[PDB]
Amino acid sequence: APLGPFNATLLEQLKNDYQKGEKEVTRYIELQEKVAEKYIKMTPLSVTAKKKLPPSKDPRDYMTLSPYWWPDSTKIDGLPYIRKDGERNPEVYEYPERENANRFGDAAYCLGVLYYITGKEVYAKACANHLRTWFTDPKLGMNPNMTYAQAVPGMKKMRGSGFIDSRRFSRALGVAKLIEGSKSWTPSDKKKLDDWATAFCYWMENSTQGQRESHAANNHGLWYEAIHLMVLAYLDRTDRIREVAEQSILPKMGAQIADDGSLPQELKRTLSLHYSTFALEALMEANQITSQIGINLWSTPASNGKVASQAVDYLYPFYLNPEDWKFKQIKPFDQSRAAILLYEAGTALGNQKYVDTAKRIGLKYSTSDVETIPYLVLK
Amino acid sequence: SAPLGPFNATLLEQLKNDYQKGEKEVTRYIELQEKVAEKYIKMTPLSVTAKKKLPPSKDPRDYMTLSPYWWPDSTKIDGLPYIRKDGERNPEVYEYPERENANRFGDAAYCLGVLYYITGKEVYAKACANHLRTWFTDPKLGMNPNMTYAQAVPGMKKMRGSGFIDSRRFSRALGVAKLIEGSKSWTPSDKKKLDDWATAFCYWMENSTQGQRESHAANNHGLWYEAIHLMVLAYLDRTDRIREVAEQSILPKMGAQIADDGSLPQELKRTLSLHYSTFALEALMEANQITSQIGINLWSTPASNGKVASQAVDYLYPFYLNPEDWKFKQIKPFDQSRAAILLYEAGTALGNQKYVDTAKRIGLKYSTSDVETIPYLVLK
Numbered sequence: 001a002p003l004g005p006f007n008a009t010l011l012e013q014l015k016n017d018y019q020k021g022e023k024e025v026t027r028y029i030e031l032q033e034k035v036a037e038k039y040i041k042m043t044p045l046s047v048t049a050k051k052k053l054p055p056s057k058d059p060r061d062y063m064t065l066s067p068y069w070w071p072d073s074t075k076i077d078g079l080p081y082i083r084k085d086g087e088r089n090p091e092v093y094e095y096p097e098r099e100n101a102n103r104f105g106d107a108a109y110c111l112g113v114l115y116y117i118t119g120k121e122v123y124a125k126a127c128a129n130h131l132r133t134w135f136t137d138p139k140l141g142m143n144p145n146m147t148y149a150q151a152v153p154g155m156k157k158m159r160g161s162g163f164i165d166s167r168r169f170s171r172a173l174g175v176a177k178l179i180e181g182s183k184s185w186t187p188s189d190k191k192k193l194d195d196w197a198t199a200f201c202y203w204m205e206n207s208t209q210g211q212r213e214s215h216a217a218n219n220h221g222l223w224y225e226a227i228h229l230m231v232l233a234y235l236d237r238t239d240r241i242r243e244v245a246e247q248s249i250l251p252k253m254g255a256q257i258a259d260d261g262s263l264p265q266e267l268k269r270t271l272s273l274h275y276s277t278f279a280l281e282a283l284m285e286a287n288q289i290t291s292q293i294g295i296n297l298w299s300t301p302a303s304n305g306k307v308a309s310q311a312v313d314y315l316y317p318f319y320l321n322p323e324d325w326k327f328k329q330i331k332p333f334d335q336s337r338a339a340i341l342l343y344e345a346g347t348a349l350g351n352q353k354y355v356d357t358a359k360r361i362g363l364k365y366s367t368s369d370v371e372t373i374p375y376l377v378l379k
Numbered sequence: 380s381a382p383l384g385p386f387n388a389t390l391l392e393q394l395k396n397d398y399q400k401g402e403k404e405v406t407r408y409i410e411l412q413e414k415v416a417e418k419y420i421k422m423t424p425l426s427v428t429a430k431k432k433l434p435p436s437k438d439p440r441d442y443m444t445l446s447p448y449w450w451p452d453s454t455k456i457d458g459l460p461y462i463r464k465d466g467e468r469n470p471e472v473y474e475y476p477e478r479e480n481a482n483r484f485g486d487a488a489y490c491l492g493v494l495y496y497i498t499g500k501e502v503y504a505k506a507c508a509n510h511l512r513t514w515f516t517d518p519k520l521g522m523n524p525n526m527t528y529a530q531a532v533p534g535m536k537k538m539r540g541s542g543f544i545d546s547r548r549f550s551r552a553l554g555v556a557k558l559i560e561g562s563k564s565w566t567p568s569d570k571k572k573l574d575d576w577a578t579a580f581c582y583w584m585e586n587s588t589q590g591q592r593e594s595h596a597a598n599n600h601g602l603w604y605e606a607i608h609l610m611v612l613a614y615l616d617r618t619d620r621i622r623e624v625a626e627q628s629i630l631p632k633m634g635a636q637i638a639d640d641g642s643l644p645q646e647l648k649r650t651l652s653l654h655y656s657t658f659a660l661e662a663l664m665e666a667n668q669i670t671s672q673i674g675i676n677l678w679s680t681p682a683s684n685g686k687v688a689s690q691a692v693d694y695l696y697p698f699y700l701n702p703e704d705w706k707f708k709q710i711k712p713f714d715q716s717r718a719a720i721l722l723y724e725a726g727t728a729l730g731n732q733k734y735v736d737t738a739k740r741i742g743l744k745y746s747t748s749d750v751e752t753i754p755y756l757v758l759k
């Protein structure tokens with residue numbers, strides 16, 4: 001399997017069994033094919049489909065609103081916005097990119113994985129239509145930056161926090177690897193997308209905002225490195241992946257896991273069980289890439305001896321019973337998020353207890369959630 | 380003599396009097412309100428027809444929103460039929476522009492209409508009328524007088540009445556139009572058209588199958604149905620209907636929903652049970668602002684079964700002091716500011732100083748731009 005942001009073992013297993021005609025996998029891939037048919041018809045989305053322009057006046061600049069920032073009723077014009085941690089301001093849906101990056105990301109990811117598994121050219125053709133439009137088109141493609149992501153009206157300083165939005169379309173960037181060699185993904189297509197990814201990676205590493213985000217003390221820093229790895233793996237820069245793993249991910253993990261295994265930076269949030277899980281989800285997705293080159297982020301210690309397994313240990317009780325959670329969680333926690341997390345951390349740590357609970361929680365056999373495509377083992 | 384409408388007419392009258400007599404404190408406050416009201420004079424009138432996805436009737440003048448707690452089923456190839464997650468608002472609701480635009484229209488018209496009553500400045504009647512015409516009566520941009528496709532649910536086979544509760548956003552603006560009668564901007568033809576629309580809307584409320592169902596609802600939908608009913612009836616000056624509705628529908632519905640201890644069992648079973656307990660009384664509170672204008676006090680008048688709405692305030696009052704003591708499911712935090720206006724209204728109606736004191740202690744922010752708080756200088 002090519003290097004990319006997915007469990008390559010589960011993907012290889014599925015393609016292997018599908019080609020062998022194995023009855024149970026074959027009908028499962030056929031259901032996925034039935035779910036994926038809406039993505040073949042779907043019109044490609046573009047970041048430029050917005051009316052309100054960002055300060056650059058360029059519709060190709062991605063812009064969303066930072067979700068927890070609200071107008072201040074006690075100001076005639078509402079400015080400057082104020083923060084209510086954990087309460088999503090519905091003004092976020094006035095920026096079409098917020099949901100459209102998700103819609104595009106799901107479509108490209110699902111089609112690419114189906115093309116890899118089945119070899120059917122119809123999936124590469126449709127995946128490529130989405131990739132070209134979203135990334136490389138000279139009129140419709142998004143500029144390779146996240147300058148105006150999670151802007152806050154009337155905030156004086158530029159922030160890097162919006163970079164975390166990138167995870168929606170960066171999974172799709174990596175899945176582009178899977179359609180290389182099809183008839184639809186031409187060398188010219190690959191060149192343009194390589195150049196875009198090179199430019200986006202330059203922006204991540206050298207813009208002031210990217211630099212700040214790479215030093216974030218909480219899950220923003222972890223998700224920054226998960227996204228970085230997706231870009232680097234798409235550009236086939238495996239040596240950089242190791243260096244990021246050992247000079248950034250491991251030190252960050254070693255600083256953010258407390259001695260007891262809790263994540264103090266996520267504990268202080270209004271959705272602290274969501275953000276403990278979200279922080280580990282960054283690690284899980286980073287690990288799917290590092291482990292394809294022999295680096296197990298779950299078991300590899302930081303310089304101070306801390307290991308990511310300790311953070312799963314701390315949380316595992318509360319995944320069995322989320323109502324036992326003793327920290328602030330102003331909205332109910334979705335236990336289904338732990339299924340994939342516990343499976344991924346479970347197999348990587350040879351911990352059957354985690355894997356057992358992962359299948360008992362399970363995923364819906366017929367769910368259309370694209371991130372669950374590889375996890376038949378959970379259905 | 381403040382016209383019959385959906386507002387605390389007592390507080391509205393004091394403000395106009397003090398403003399006219401120059402009292403410094405009201406004058407400063409109305410000047411703040413005027414500064415907030417400037418965005419409504421600049422704002423382009425909204426229309427229900429500004430939507431892309433049409434309803435089954437193919438008519439953009441038909442109001443349509445999505446029922447907020449209905450989500451696609453991931454386990455079905457087309458997501459259909461939707462399934463319900465009580466208390467979790469599906470962000471798809473924002474794909475129907477009426478959801479927020481009825482709210483923006485109603486706030487604008489209510490604010491401009493009240494400022495015109497307080498200040499007499501014709502610029503406020505002019506802008507209010509522009510919003511009212513565009514939303515209600517315009518032959519191309521005005522909404523049809525019905526709520527057939529309000530809170531539709533995709534792939535649901537039966538028509539429901541639950542979406543009628545959406546009407547409270549624009550029916551308050553309907554009532555405020557009474558305040559700009561006699562201005563230069565609101566012509567007899569304007570009033571005639573809106574009278575005819577409201578008459579048509581009232582006919583739909585009372586005779587459509589959806590309106591009949593919603594009028595029989597056992598929970599806060601029945602209270603809000605009659606509060607909206609009263610706003611329409613007061614705008615149409617049908618004071619006898621108001622009286623009949625107060626005694627034959629609101630009080631019996633109120634009495635059937637109040638438990639022995641004062642709780643509201645129908646709202647208790649919700650995932651947002653302290654919010655929906657408060658939402659039920661807010662229906663009663665706004666109905667009362669209209670009934671009390673013609674001598675019927677819904678806070679103190681007992682129902683045929685002996686239940687009285689004051690009993691439901693007693694039950695909730697401890698939990699307004701300390702919202703974390705609420706023992707029932709509340710999957711989102713409860714905003715205590717909502718209890719300010721509610722406790723002031725019931726307090727003044729029930730002669731209960733403890734409630735009015737707690738209302739002023741909680742207070743509203745003096746400089747807030749929340750239009751529904753305009754009358755309540757006494758709380759700021």
Ligand SMILES: O=C(O)[C@H]1O[C@@H](O[C@H]2[C@H](O)[C@H](O)[C@H](O[C@H]3[C@H](O)[C@H](O)[C@H](O[C@H]4[C@H](O)[C@H](O)[C@H](O[C@H]5[C@H](O)[C@H](O)[C@H](O)O[C@@H]5C(=O)O)O[C@H]4C(=O)O)O[C@@H]3C(=O)O)O[C@H]2C(=O)O)[C@@H](O)[C@@H](O)[C@@H]1O
Nearest residue numbers: 066067068069083085088150161162164218219220275278
């Ligand atoms: O894909 C999915 O898994 C899932 O994601 C959903 O997207 C949501 C989720 O909540 C997601 O976890 C993520 O949350 C972000 C969020 O977008 C903001 O970036 C928010 O930003 C916070 C952080 O705390 C940040 O470090 C900083 O905080 C500081 C403040 O600025 C302030 O000054 C304060 O006093 O001090 C703090 C501090 O750092 O000490 O900025 C905050 C801010 O609010 O600006 O952070 C979280 C996060 O990652 O921590 O994204 C959400 C989103 O809506 O984008 C959703 O899409 C769902 O459907 C998916 O399934």
Ligand SMILES: O=C(O)[C@H]1O[C@@H](O[C@H]2[C@H](O)[C@H](O)[C@H](O[C@H]3[C@H](O)[C@H](O)[C@H](O[C@H]4[C@H](O)[C@H](O)[C@H](O[C@H]5[C@H](O)[C@H](O)[C@H](O)O[C@@H]5C(=O)O)O[C@H]4C(=O)O)O[C@@H]3C(=O)O)O[C@H]2C(=O)O)[C@@H](O)[C@@H](O)[C@@H]1O
Nearest residue numbers: 446447448449463465468530541542544598599600655658
């Ligand atoms: O103005 C403000 O204070 C504030 O309000 C905000 O608007 C929100 C609020 O929650 C508001 O109170 C209102 O809630 C409604 C909601 O729109 C639905 O109509 C919902 O409908 C529920 C009811 O239970 C209904 O009786 C029925 O329930 C049945 C189910 O369909 C199901 O089959 C079940 O098994 O059986 C029940 C049954 O009892 O028969 O339909 C339900 C449904 O979910 O379909 O009810 C509530 C309500 O009034 O009780 O509207 C919300 C909204 O999102 O519009 C918001 O506007 C804010 O900005 C304001 O400031």
